[PDB]
């Protein structure tokens, strides 16, 4: 056993267990008894310890103090790595780094690696929560009835995705002594979550996998320990370590870019559609109704619509149009081109952007540069992604049909393209949607004309964005992954999970807006209004965070993007899109301080702003308030 006492904080780690756990303002935490931190190949998992060589160095730097663990031979394949636990000497954080060394023609490949091991939690007191970035966000009781696995996590609890819009969780004692762990490594990376039905425990642990097929490069998880802790806390803990590495974008650094950022606030959003064409190859093709497979609304139609939506007091309006161009919604990516002739052409749609601007209402174009459709005009397998085997994806799911993945490194080439030709026909965008940039992971790509890692994916898909912030022209994005903060102004949405699930599904936690505590002054994110039949008023969530409403949101597919069912429920909507709307245009670039239980009772909850205004939502009444006070 070795022992480390700094700044604070005691690590102890055991030689032979490899176990270890550490402690500040006198309470404790240690790995679990029984998980131990594993390898996984294609034909089985390794524990560390079961390493043919293991040997152990005690380390004191300028930096901080700590150990370094070697371990070497395996099963009988060569293969070896380290890892570095450590005490910053500045914080009073521990910091646990994996570290690639000799990997061979391994055989098979790594294929994930789980370490650190999770912390024991496993008490059961209701108040003993785990926190997880599943899209906005979810608290999940000790005790809480229903099973959360990682397989019911979206993309397998993968940070930079819906499934962990941010690279972090946390554990939260009722003492208030809580720790969070920090995911600095997040492109191939994402954490493990086993909460079964009924507790009493909840364990939380971080993945890895390779690199183009190498973990390649050292990975590494942050934990800070701390007291007299809420949620809010936490979450600030994290705000600060992103600022502190010059990613936390502010709306108002934004707005100083291109201040047509501001218009956003207060605004009311329409998400409806051109054209539909639903391929024979696609998986939501209907070969009975022709009339499902195949339906238009003309520019003009969308026009008059509009009309319509001011003239009846709607007020100031963002219109997202859908299916815009003549492959229809889904068909023919990248070549997303011209404009829809049967729906009025580009005069058509030149004539309805013109009409939006005319009565002081914002217009964005649905586009996408991941989907990659074999019925393309200039489809060409050489620019397609391969995965790490040098394979080619497919799939038909969506309207186009046959389809694989454009490797991003080319996307920037087909945005340049495509919107310098938008804009020679007098179109100008007020915004974007490019889609599923932010919602999916970042794909990897092993062709030689254009390799590209997890980690360079980001970065081409924010330089997507950055050409359009370039020429004034606002971003939006399915969801929020917090990678794209830096480049993304607004989106589609950022839904709590249980938003994107029936209502009659059971939930997996507690809706409390981890994203929006981080983010809410840096994103501006539109909300679902849909009123459950028998429980909630989504739009008492919108409240809470801030945000602008949904007015109309018609669904591209039925079932998918949060589309509700029918044991839903609403008339009156300008009105409910007009009170929140206002909250929209009063806080939409501030802060959110605070967000609590009321009392520690769940169903009633407030958020706090930067102007001091508070939301105080209550779900036994389905009642709202916003105030001034705080
Ligand atoms: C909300 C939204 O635009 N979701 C879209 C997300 N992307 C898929 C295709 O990748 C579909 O177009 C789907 O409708
Ligand atoms: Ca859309
Ligand atoms: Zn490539």
């Not at 070697?70 to 910053?88: H, L, M, N, Q, S």
């Not at 294929?111 to 997880?132: E, G, K, Q």
């Not at 992954?481 to 999970?497: E, G, K, M, Q, R």
């Not at 059971?506 to 840096?522: E, F, K, S």
Request: with cysteine.
């Amino acid at each position: 056993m070795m022992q480390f006492t700094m700044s604070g904080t005691m690590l102890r780690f055991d030689e032979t267990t490899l176990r270890f756990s550490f402690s500040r303002d006198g309470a404790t935490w240690s790995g679990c008894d029984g998980i131990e931190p594993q390898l996984t190949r294609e034909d089985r998992s390794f524990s560390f310890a079961g390493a043919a060589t293991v040997t152990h160095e005690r380390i004191e730097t300028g930096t901080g103090v700590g150990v370094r663990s070697v371990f070497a031979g395996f099963a009988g394949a060569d293969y070896a790595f380290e890892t570095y636990i450590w005490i910053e000497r500045s914080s009073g954080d521990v910091l646990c780094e994996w570290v690639p060394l000799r990997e061979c023609g391994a055989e098979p490949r790594i294929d994930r690696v789980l370490w650190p091991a999770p912390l024991s939690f496993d008490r059961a007191d209701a108040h003993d929560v785990t926190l997880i970035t599943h899209e906005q966000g979810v608290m999940i009781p000790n005790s809480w009835p229903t099973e959360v696995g990682t397989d019911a996590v979206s993309f397998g609890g993968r940070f930079e995705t819906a499934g962990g819009y941010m690279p972090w969780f946390a554990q939260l004692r009722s003492d208030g002594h809580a720790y969070i762990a920090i995911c600095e490594t997040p492109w191939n990376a994402g954490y493990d979550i086993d909460h079964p039905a009924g507790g009493p425990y909840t364990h939380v642990g971080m993945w890895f996998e390779p690199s183009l097929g190498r973990m390649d490069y050292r990975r590494v998880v942050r934990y800070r320990l701390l007291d007299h802790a809420d949620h809010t806390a936490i979450c600030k803990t994290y705000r600060a370590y992103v600022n502190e590495r010059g990613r936390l974008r502010t709306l108002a650094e934004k707005a100083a870019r291109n201040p047509s950022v501001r218009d956003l606030l207060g605004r009311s959003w329409v998400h409806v559609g051109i054209k539909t064409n639903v391929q024979p190859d696609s998986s939501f093709y209907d070969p009975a109704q022709p009339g499902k497979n195949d339906s238009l609304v003309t520019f003009a139609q969308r026009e008059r619509q509009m009309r319509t939506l001011h003239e009846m007091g709607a007020g100031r309006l963002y219109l997202h149009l859908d299916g815009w161009a003549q492959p229809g919604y889904d068909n023919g990516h990248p070549d997303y081109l011209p404009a829809c002739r049967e729906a009025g052409g580009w005069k058509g749609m030149k004539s309805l952007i013109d009409a939006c601007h005319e009565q002081g209402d914002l217009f964005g174009t649905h586009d996408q540069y991941r989907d990659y459709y074999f019925a393309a005009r200039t489809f060409d397998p050489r620019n397609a992604i391969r995965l790490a085997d040098g394979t080619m994806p497919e799939h038909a799911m969506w309207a186009g049909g046959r389809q694989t993945y454009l490797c991003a490194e080319l996307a920037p080439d087909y945005v340049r393209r495509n919107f310098s030709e938008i804009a020679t026909h007098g179109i100008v965008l007020d915004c974007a949607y490019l889609d599923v940039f932010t919602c999916n992971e970042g794909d990897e790509c092993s062709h030689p004309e254009h390799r590209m890692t997890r980690r360079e994916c980001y970065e081409r898909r924010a330089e997507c964005f950055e050409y359009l912030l370039a020429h004034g022209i606002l971003t939006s994005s399915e969801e929020v992954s917090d990678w794209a903060v830096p480049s993304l102004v607004f989106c589609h949405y950022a839904p709590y999970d249980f938003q994107m699930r029936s209502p009659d599904a059971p939930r997996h936690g507690i809706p409390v807006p981890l994203y929006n505590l981080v983010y809410h002054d840096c994103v501006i994110q539109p909300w679902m209004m849909d009123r459950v039949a028998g429980g909630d008023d989504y739009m008492l969530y919108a409240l809470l965070n801030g945000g602008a409403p949904y007015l109309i949101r018609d669904a591209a597919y039925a079932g998918m993007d949060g589309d509700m069912n029918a044991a839903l429920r609403t008339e009156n909507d300008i009105e409910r899109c007009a009170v929140v709307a206002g909250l929209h245009r009063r806080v939409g670039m501030q802060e959110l301080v605070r967000h609590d239980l009321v009392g520690g009772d769940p169903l009633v909850q407030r958020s706090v702003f930067a102007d001091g205004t508070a939301v105080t939502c209550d779900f036994h009444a389905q009642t709202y308030e916003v105030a001034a006070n705080g």
